[PDB]
Amino acid sequence: SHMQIFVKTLTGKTITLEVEPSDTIENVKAKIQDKEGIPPDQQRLIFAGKQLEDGRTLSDYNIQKESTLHLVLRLRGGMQIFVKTLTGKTITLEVEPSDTIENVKAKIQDKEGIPPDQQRLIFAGKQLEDGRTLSDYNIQKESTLHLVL
Amino acid sequence: VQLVESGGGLVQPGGSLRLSCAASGFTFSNTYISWVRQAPGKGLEWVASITPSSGQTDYADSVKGRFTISADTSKNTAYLQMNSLRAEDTAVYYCARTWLLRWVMDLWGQGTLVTVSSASTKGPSVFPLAPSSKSTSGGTAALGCLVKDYFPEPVTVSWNSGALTSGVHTFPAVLQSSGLYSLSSVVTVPSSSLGTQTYICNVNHKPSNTKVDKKVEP
Amino acid sequence: DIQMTQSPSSLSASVGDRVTITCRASQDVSTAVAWYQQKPGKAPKLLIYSAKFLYSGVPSRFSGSGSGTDFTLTISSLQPEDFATYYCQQSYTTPPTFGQGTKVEIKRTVAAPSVFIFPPSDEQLKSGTASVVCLLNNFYPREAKVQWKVDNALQSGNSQESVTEQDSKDSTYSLSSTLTLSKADYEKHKVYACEVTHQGLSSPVTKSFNR
């Protein structure tokens, strides 16, 4: 069933979009390009604190009628970081600032075989939340996170 | 909402200098920060960019190796360390904010002047441009104020302490071969306001802590 | 580096006129082009981005167009505040590059400059100068040729000129020719002339004096 959503921009501006629950995130970001002029691969859509990811759909994030999305600049550029288990060995990961902490765990599970529900990442004495990105924590390049455990 | 710059000033060739770019009303979260300079009479040139939240950096070739762009995320302030400075590094440096799409500068700071010269700071010598039959044309006379041999830019010139602004023409500074600047501030007054009206030229040169009130008499 | 070439480098127009600046990229950059407005002594401001998307706070009279290598900035109805320098830019790839700029100045009929001459200063002479000043006031356009002659001996490379920004009131310019000699030299000559050639002057005008 058709649906209206609202996208607030950093420039004190709220855009109305005509969408469907089946619409993919990339399909929505394209609509935002036509209206706001921002390249899809540079848009970071936020909802309830969760980053809407490409390949998914609005329904996957339970986006209901008249929901409000926030648009910010998706920070781009490949770089490497390090993850040292508290034991501990160190592995090197190729990431972008816009990669979520949940994404980082999936990459750790890919080479260390560690299930995400067992992974707890630390940096600067803080616990990194799955929903947020590396950017949100100012994780510099060459930084070393601490996996627990 | 703005960017406030500082750190610019006077430095000798091969010397070092650091610029600062403090944010106000916004954070460096989800943004790139860039430095763009403008040479005198020239256009705009991109100096360097940074992703404050990741420390990733990018430099223009003409500067890649001498300058270093950094950021203090904690305080939403970006810096520009400039080493091995040169005469052609003389320009007005802007810091710009990108938060819409890469490389687009949606917010530019006030600006800070960087001058690279061996000519040391010097106060200007104010010489009057007396109004006479040689500076007249009907019912309108003309007088000036000569601000000569000062370094480095720049100087402020007013007339009658801001009171007189009509018909005032302060000219853009020109760099003398000595390495020092010089210019004139002129004004066209009624031919009959002379002898009945005082005309003072307020010259102010902060870099040398010089403030002068010059009275131009016929 | 991708080269961005603007055209023309300068254009004159009157209030209410429709203006169109062109930007050319050395290669394809799709719609990754932005436009900035700048004014004397001030920082640039974003006007258009992604070729045709207006930035917040920008009057709807500004419009953008084009994709590939050919882009255009259009101002529907020129306003007194729209008179400034305009830069285009490509955000397609690194490094980002700007155009040389296109200055939009105010149009008006030709105006003859008022020429004035200021002999050196007595108090100045007491130091080593030597500096005579020549003033061309309120003229248009800004093209003017000033010549110096110390006892009918043409001077060159010893005088520096300076032109003001178009006066917001009458849209005129002002050029100053400053000739700075040495005290010793200034004493060896008595006739100091200033010849000015301009569109407004049907015949070069000279303003001289005697030491």
Side-chain angles (χ1 to χ4, degrees):
Chain A
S1 198
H2 184 267
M3 179 165 45
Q4 275 194 342
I5 67 179
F6 303 139
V7 179
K8 287 176 61 65
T9 63
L10 295 174
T11 57
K13 178 176 183 181
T14 171
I15 290 70
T16 301
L17 294 171
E18 312 300 321
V19 302
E20 300 286 338
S22 58
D23 286 339
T24 64
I25 301 301
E26 57 270 21
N27 192 31
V28 172
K29 288 178 180 177
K31 292 181 181 297
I32 292 183
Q33 183 178 28
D34 285 20
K35 283 198 142 55
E36 185 62 12
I38 304 177
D41 67 6
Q42 293 199 56
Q43 310 178 19
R44 178 184 175 187
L45 292 180
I46 287 76
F47 177 69
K50 174 177 293 295
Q51 173 163 316
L52 282 52
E53 184 65 355
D54 304 321
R56 298 289 177 85
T57 67
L58 298 173
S59 53
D60 287 329
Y61 296 93
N62 295 127
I63 301 291
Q64 287 148 16
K65 287 181 172 58
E66 298 194 353
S67 293
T68 278
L69 310 187
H70 290 250
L71 172 58
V72 301
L73 174 55
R74 186 178 169 179
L75 299 173
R76 290 295 215 155
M79 72 186 182
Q80 283 183 168
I81 59 177
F82 310 111
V83 191
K84 178 180 182 179
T85 62
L86 264 60
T87 72
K89 69 172 298 185
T90 298
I91 82 170
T92 308
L93 298 178
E94 186 161 316
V95 303
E96 295 183 87
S98 64
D99 290 339
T100 60
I101 304 306
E102 175 170 327
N103 176 74
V104 171
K105 291 180 181 174
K107 245 176 204 109
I108 293 177
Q109 178 196 14
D110 183 32
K111 35 187 54 185
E112 295 302 320
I114 302 183
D117 64 25
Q118 301 180 198
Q119 301 185 34
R120 174 185 300 176
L121 294 167
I122 312 294
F123 178 86
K126 299 151 64 79
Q127 175 174 357
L128 313 179
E129 294 274 321
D130 289 328
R132 307 187 66 181
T133 65
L134 301 163
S135 306
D136 300 326
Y137 296 107
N138 288 316
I139 308 298
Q140 307 290 299
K141 69 197 194 78
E142 308 294 344
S143 291
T144 297
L145 313 169
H146 302 274
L147 183 56
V148 180
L149 291 169
Chain B
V1 184
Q2 66 180 15
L3 286 166
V4 180
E5 298 122 317
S6 58
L10 173 56
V11 57
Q12 314 179 261
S16 300
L17 185 58
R18 176 184 49 83
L19 299 178
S20 290
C21 176
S24 178
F26 73 102
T27 76
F28 283 173
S29 294
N30 310 121
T31 201
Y32 303 109
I33 307 295
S34 301
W35 285 97
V36 181
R37 66 180 172 187
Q38 187 173 45
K42 281 282 194 173
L44 295 177
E45 182 191 15
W46 165 79
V47 180
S49 293
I50 191 176
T51 309
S53 59
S54 71
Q56 293 168 294
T57 58
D58 210 351
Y59 299 92
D61 295 334
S62 63
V63 157
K64 196 290 173 182
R66 309 191 323 282
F67 292 8
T68 297
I69 184 171
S70 72
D72 184 344
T73 59
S74 178
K75 292 191 57 182
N76 293 321
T77 296
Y79 302 93
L80 186 67
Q81 189 67 37
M82 305 186 298
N83 300 320
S84 302
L85 283 159
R86 305 158 174 174
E88 76 273 16
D89 288 334
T90 288
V92 174
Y93 286 67
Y94 304 107
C95 61
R97 173 247 281 161
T98 294
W99 76 354
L100 256 60
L101 65 86
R102 218 167 196 184
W103 304 126
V104 169
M105 319 299 178
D106 53 80
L107 182 66
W108 300 63
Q110 291 77 72
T112 187
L113 177 66
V114 166
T115 178
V116 188
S117 173
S118 54
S120 53
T121 68
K122 192 180 93 65
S125 300
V126 187
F127 301 132
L129 302 186
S132 58
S133 58
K134 302 176 252 298
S135 63
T136 310
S137 176
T140 62
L143 60 157
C145 202
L146 176 63
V147 196
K148 190 172 182 297
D149 299 337
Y150 66 87
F151 201 74
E153 212 92 29
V155 160
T156 68
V157 181
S158 61
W159 287 93
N160 291 335
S161 301
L164 172 52
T165 75
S166 184
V168 172
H169 286 269
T170 307
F171 285 90
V174 291
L175 184 56
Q176 296 170 91
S177 61
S178 61
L180 309 170
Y181 297 104
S182 182
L183 64 81
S184 301
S185 182
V186 301
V187 52
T188 56
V189 299
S191 179
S192 58
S193 58
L194 306 166
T196 169
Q197 172 64 308
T198 298
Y199 295 104
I200 306 172
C201 172
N202 315 272
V203 175
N204 192 31
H205 184 67
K206 286 286 153 288
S208 74
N209 198 342
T210 281
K211 177 198 291 290
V212 175
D213 286 337
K214 182 64 183 181
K215 183 178 179 177
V216 174
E217 290 178 336
Chain C
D1 296 24
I2 301 185
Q3 194 179 21
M4 303 295 285
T5 301
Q6 299 182 226
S7 167
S9 292
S10 172
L11 66 83
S12 295
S14 48
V15 174
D17 284 344
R18 180 179 178 272
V19 182
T20 298
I21 304 174
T22 67
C23 188
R24 180 178 303 274
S26 56
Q27 59 181 271
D28 191 309
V29 293
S30 54
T31 53
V33 169
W35 293 88
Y36 304 91
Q37 171 192 84
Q38 184 182 31
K39 297 179 181 180
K42 295 183 174 184
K45 295 180 182 296
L46 175 70
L47 297 167
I48 301 282
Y49 69 88
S50 297
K52 61 161 179 167
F53 286 85
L54 209 52
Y55 188 64
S56 298
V58 177
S60 302
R61 62 180 176 270
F62 292 104
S63 57
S65 187
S67 69
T69 68
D70 303 320
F71 306 84
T72 57
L73 194 179
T74 298
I75 308 180
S76 69
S77 191
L78 203 51
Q79 298 293 74
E81 60 270 8
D82 300 342
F83 290 96
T85 303
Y86 291 81
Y87 296 96
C88 75
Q89 184 202 331
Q90 62 87 18
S91 57
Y92 179 71
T93 192
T94 189
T97 54
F98 305 82
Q100 83 279 6
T102 290
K103 192 171 185 178
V104 178
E105 294 175 334
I106 312 189
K107 217 181 188 183
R108 68 177 310 283
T109 51
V110 177
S114 295
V115 189
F116 304 100
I117 191 66
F118 296 82
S121 189
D122 286 327
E123 33 281 282
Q124 186 187 2
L125 299 184
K126 316 174 89 170
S127 60
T129 19
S131 203
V132 54
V133 168
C134 186
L135 173 62
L136 294 59
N137 222 35
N138 300 16
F139 56 91
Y140 187 93
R142 57 172 288 133
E143 295 83 43
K145 176 232 297 179
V146 180
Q147 286 186 346
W148 288 96
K149 292 185 292 292
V150 171
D151 283 334
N152 230 9
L154 291 65
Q155 300 295 111
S156 299
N158 43 267
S159 73
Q160 294 165 154
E161 293 73 21
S162 182
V163 183
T164 50
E165 292 294 346
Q166 197 171 28
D167 186 82
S168 55
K169 189 179 182 182
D170 54 25
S171 304
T172 67
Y173 304 92
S174 298
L175 189 158
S176 67
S177 288
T178 301
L179 191 89
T180 301
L181 308 167
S182 72
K183 167 87 179 307
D185 190 338
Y186 177 72
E187 297 178 333
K188 299 186 300 182
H189 301 102
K190 73 169 195 57
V191 160
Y192 297 102
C194 180
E195 196 190 47
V196 177
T197 70
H198 182 79
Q199 297 187 9
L201 300 173
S202 62
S203 304
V205 173
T206 303
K207 296 301 173 61
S208 65
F209 76 90
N210 288 95
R211 178 175 60 95

